[PDB]
Amino acid sequence: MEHDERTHVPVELRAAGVVLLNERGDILLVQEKGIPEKAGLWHIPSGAVEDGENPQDAAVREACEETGLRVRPVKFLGAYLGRFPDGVLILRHVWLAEPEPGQTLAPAFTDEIAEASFVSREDFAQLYAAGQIRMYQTKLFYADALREKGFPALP
Amino acid sequence: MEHDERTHVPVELRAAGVVLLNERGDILLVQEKGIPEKAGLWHIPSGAVEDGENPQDAAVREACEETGLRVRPVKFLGAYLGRFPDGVLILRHVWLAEPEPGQTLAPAFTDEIAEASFVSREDFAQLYAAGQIRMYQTKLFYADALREKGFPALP
Numbered sequence A, B: 001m002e003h004d005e006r007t008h009v010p011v012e013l014r015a016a017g018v019v020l021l022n023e024r025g026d027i028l029l030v031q032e033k034g035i036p037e038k039a040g041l042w043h044i045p046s047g048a049v050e051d052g053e054n055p056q057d058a059a060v061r062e063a064c065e066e067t068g069l070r071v072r073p074v075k076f077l078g079a080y081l082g083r084f085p086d087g088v089l090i091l092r093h094v095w096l097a098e099p100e101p102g103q104t105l106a107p108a109f110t111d112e113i114a115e116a117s118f119v120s121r122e123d124f125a126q127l128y129a130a131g132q133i134r135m136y137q138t139k140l141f142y143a144d145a146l147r148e149k150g151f152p153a154l155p
């Protein structure tokens, strides 16, 4: 910052993801694989930022790795901080993104990902109310993205 | 985010700024006004992000407010965390930016800003060695910006 003294707060982990909207304002979400009979929760395409690599590039890379979609970062939306039980800090970065044209959703099925898909604003609202969105920040950023693009707001 | 539980670490303040490079790779820096007064230290154009407002837009706004230059954010470079003595956290955001053409540097002289100017890579290296760069992160991000644009690295 400026001249008022402050100490450094080391952030060991950083993650980057995107709020990817299509032409209708639907959001691209990734689902966790399980949790016995409960479905895994949903989150935005996002993954770890390699130490030293640009978080913006990581967001783009991760989106493609998880959904098979090449995306273009449109605008930075925000970053927020979390702390694991052991004290490790993680800074999550989020960008508004748009998919490049002529692509087919093809999720990467792993022990961490069950699938990925576009969800409408209306159904997202239901998922959120149902407690199926892992990080509530997803709703906050989806709302921001909708406003930025000029789409109607969540129900 | 991705299912391992973590707590929220509230960040009360957010700042946004830019590493603005011209066609030669010179960097735009802002100088503090004093304190034993002579020679205030240098920092990138940066200012407080209004609560709720987009940090990227804030970086662009602040750059214009402090230097008189309208700038275009080119790419996100990074964000880092600091803590004031009272415990308040501040998250600083940095973008690589380019000035729009046909502009004249016209700094905003206030009780916080002595002036602003473009400094060459060579002189920046001297300023840094001389301990005249308030936040060392400035050198780290300047280095990142130079690599991104394809300019030679700092001495």
Ligand SMILES: Nc1nc2c(ncn2[C@@H]2O[C@H](COP(=O)(O)OP(=O)(O)NP(=O)(O)O)[C@@H](O)[C@H]2O)c(=O)[nH]1
Binding pocket: A013, A014, A015, A016, A017, A030, A043, A044, A045, A046, A047, A048, A049, A084, A085, A086, A088, A090, A112, B001, B002, B003, B004, B005
């Ligand atoms: N408890 C705990 N969790 C950790 C630790 N280190 C990493 N993690 C977890 O490992 C994750 C690393 O993945 P990350 O890059 O954040 O990806 P992500 O985008 O959050 N996952 P997604 O979105 O696919 O579910 C963190 O989000 C965090 O949950 C640790 O020391 N302790």
Ligand SMILES: Nc1nc2c(ncn2[C@@H]2O[C@H](COP(=O)(O)OP(=O)(O)NP(=O)(O)O)[C@@H](O)[C@H]2O)c(=O)[nH]1
Binding pocket: A001, A002, A003, A004, A005, B013, B014, B015, B016, B017, B045, B046, B047, B048, B049, B084, B085, B086, B088, B090
């Ligand atoms: N010690 C201390 N200083 C504070 C606190 N809040 C604000 N400040 C000081 O007040 C200044 C202005 O507020 P802040 O939002 O941090 O400014 P900024 O936009 O980040 N500044 P800059 O653009 O120059 O980096 C800061 O640069 C910091 O020096 C606080 O709780 N404790």
Ligand SMILES: [Mg+2]
Binding pocket: A047, A048
């Ligand atoms: Mg990964």
Ligand SMILES: [Mg+2]
Binding pocket: B047, B048
């Ligand atoms: Mg200000």
